[PDB]
């Protein structure tokens, strides 16, 4: 139930109206002491960094309502140096941060408009890890209780890898809500995130998630998929 | 059944006498192109590198009978340069290799001499990942069929980490055979591996596994623990 699959399980919320967008949490990600080779910290690739490791870093923000086009490219002027920047307005966080070096978590639900095969394509500098589906990401309307128990990644991208870019193909049902978790890191210099998809219904590429990303309140009994 | 636990499942081989030692496979691990920053390749920390990634590298050797004291420290004279060296005689591989940069897999079974809590302590430069128990490591006398399906790590050590060194405490039964998998990498400069244990029966530390590490043939029906 926590394993990645081509036919993920979804959720059916009851009367409470879903809220637009995902939630985001932002954390610091320091360089190592001057003189270090390399200048950046490798912690982002400890196997548990995305599960418990990141929690020991400085919390910068927790926001709601993240939607629209969430892609970004941050161009740095040099490596090994923290430099200030801003996220796109879609992230609902107007303050400057060290865009050269930070950790970011997004979670919530994906609602399809069509029933059939979806292919999500991702790329990132330095890292983007994706979980998708009930159990694999977290449990239906029981996120706060299952948040740290996600399974093997459905897709991932690592700058410098043989998987610099990656894809996820899954069969989905329209109007069902699918748990999703995105984990991102920049360890130095440039930063980039691309998250888009296509379906078998037509040849359009979706980059704007305004009609697709939602948040659901947890409930006493949970909201397992009913279809 | 694949999850790490304090009470791992073991195996009960039938009439066929266990063979002394673990099996080992050795693979190449190249530096990046001259001028690269850093000089070493980060692939060793892709989440699937220990599962399928390493298989695309040059196979150097597959040997049997690895036992005794398996600890080593290789001292390099500089970084970013491949340098030749030798493994201890316990590894049954007498040829020189690039000890500055290689990948090594060991697998087989651990047989305890006493019933009770065991604490294994590990450390490594650059990396050592450990799985332990039926399912978590692989299935009883059905290794060849379950070898790539190991679970989350029971313990791991990464040079430069907040877990430079790590421990595994588990309750074991004497004379039972427990599946074990060790995955090691050096990405440059010095190399080191330390694997030892203590038990609740006395204050001795075990560093020599001559009476403890074994290989079992796979069988048609498998050899699940019977106790
Ligand atoms: Ca970067
Ligand atoms: Ca090293």
UniProtKB/TrEMBL annotation, chains A, B:
List of residues binding Ca(2+) 1: 14, 16
Binding-site residues for Ca(2+) 2, renumbered to this chain: 125-126, 186, 188, 190
Cysteines paired by S-S bonds: 11-140, 39-80, 141-223
Q: Where is the PA14 domain?
A: 64-211
Query: What is the name of the protein in this document?
Result: Epa1p
Q: Which organism is it from?
A: Candida glabrata
Full protein stretch here: 40 to 266 of 1034
């Amino acid at each position: 139930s926590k394993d990645p699959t081509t036919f993920p399980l979804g959720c059916s919320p009851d009367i409470t109206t879903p809220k637009k967008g995902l939630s985001m949490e932002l954390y610091s990600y320091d360089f190592r002491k001057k003189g270090s080779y390399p200048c950046w910290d490798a912690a982002y690739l400890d196997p548990n960094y995305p599960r418990t490791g990141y929690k020991s870093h400085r919390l910068l923000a927790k926001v709601d309502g993240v939607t629209g086009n969430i892609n970004f490219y941050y161009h740095a002027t040099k490596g090994c140096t923290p430099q200030l920047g801003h996220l796109p307005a879609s992230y609902n966080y107007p303050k400057p941060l060290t865009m050269t070096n930070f950790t970011m978590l997004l979670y919530g639900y994906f609602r399809p408009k069509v029933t059939g095969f979806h292919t999500f394509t991702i790329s990132a500098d330095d890292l983007l890890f994706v979980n998708f589906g009930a159990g694999n990401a977290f449990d239906c309307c029981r996120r706060d209780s299952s948040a740290d128990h996600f399974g093997n990644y459905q897709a991932y991208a690592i700058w410098g890898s043989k998987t610099a870019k990656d894809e996820l193909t899954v069969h989905l049902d329209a109007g069902v809500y699918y748990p999703i978790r995105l984990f991102y890191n920049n360890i130095g210099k440039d930063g980039a995130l691309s998250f888009t998809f296509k379906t078998e219904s037509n040849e359009n590429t979706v980059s704007d998630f305004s009609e697709y990303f939602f948040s659901l309140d947890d409930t006493e009994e949970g909201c397992p998929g009913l279809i």
